[PDB]
Amino acid sequence: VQFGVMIEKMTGKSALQYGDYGCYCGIGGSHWPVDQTDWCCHAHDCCYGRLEKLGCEPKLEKYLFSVSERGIFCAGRTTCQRLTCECDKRAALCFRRNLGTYNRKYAHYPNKLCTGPTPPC
Ligand SMILES: Cc1c(C(=O)C(N)=O)c2c(OCC(=O)O)cccc2n1Cc1ccccc1C(F)(F)F
Ligand SMILES: [Ca+2]
Ligand SMILES: [Cl-]
Ligand SMILES: [Cl-]
Ligand SMILES: [Cl-]
Ligand SMILES: [Cl-]
Ligand SMILES: [Cl-]
Ligand code: NA
């Protein structure tokens, strides 16, 4: 809900249009990212991994945020909530920054088409 809301506010698209994009947007991921938007998702997965290693549960954490002219402001009772917001913010900004190359053909991309090596974090 929260990340999805952040995606919608920052990109003008439905959350669903990122949730299953390329080889990395959506649960898990493998092989080489298809484009810059997909790289945002690779980085976001790495970000969540770092949070998991710190003892957080970023897949489950609920946080608070606002969007003004100054940008995305993150908040939350716990440090783990705020960290999760920071990973999400970076991803949502990355999506916005790459709207110019977003390609509808990579939404709901068949995972069978993901080829090549898996880049490290
Ligand atoms: C873009 C994205 C994700 C990523 O950024 C990613 N790197 O995989 C993502 C996600 O990533 C965490 C993971 O890969 O384990 C899990 C579920 C939905 C996700 N979505 C889509 C999403 C996000 C919030 C609310 C709804 C949706 C959905 F799936 F409906 F589109
Ligand atoms: Ca992923
Ligand atoms: Cl690329
Ligand atoms: Cl990151
Ligand atoms: Cl707001
Ligand atoms: Cl910002
Ligand atoms: Cl397009
Ligand atoms: Na703390």
Residue numbers in the entry: 3 to 123
Copy text from the publication.
To study the role of Asn21 in the enzymatic activity of hGIIE, we designed hGIIE variants, including N21G (mimicking hGIIA and hGV), N21M (mimicking hGX) and N21W (mimicking hGIID). For hGIIA, Gly21 can neither form the hydrogen bond nor clash with these compounds. For hGIIE, these compounds present 2–24 fold decreased inhibition effect against mutant N21G compared to the WT hGIIE. Our results on the co-crystal structure of hGIIE N21G mutant with compound 24 also confirm that the inhibitor binds much weaker to the mutant protein than the WT protein. Compound 24 in N21G structure has poor Fo-Fc map compared to the WT structure, and the occupancy of compound 24 in N21G structure is refined to only 68%. Therefore, Asn21 in hGIIE is one critical residue contributed to the best effect of these indole analogues against hGIIE.
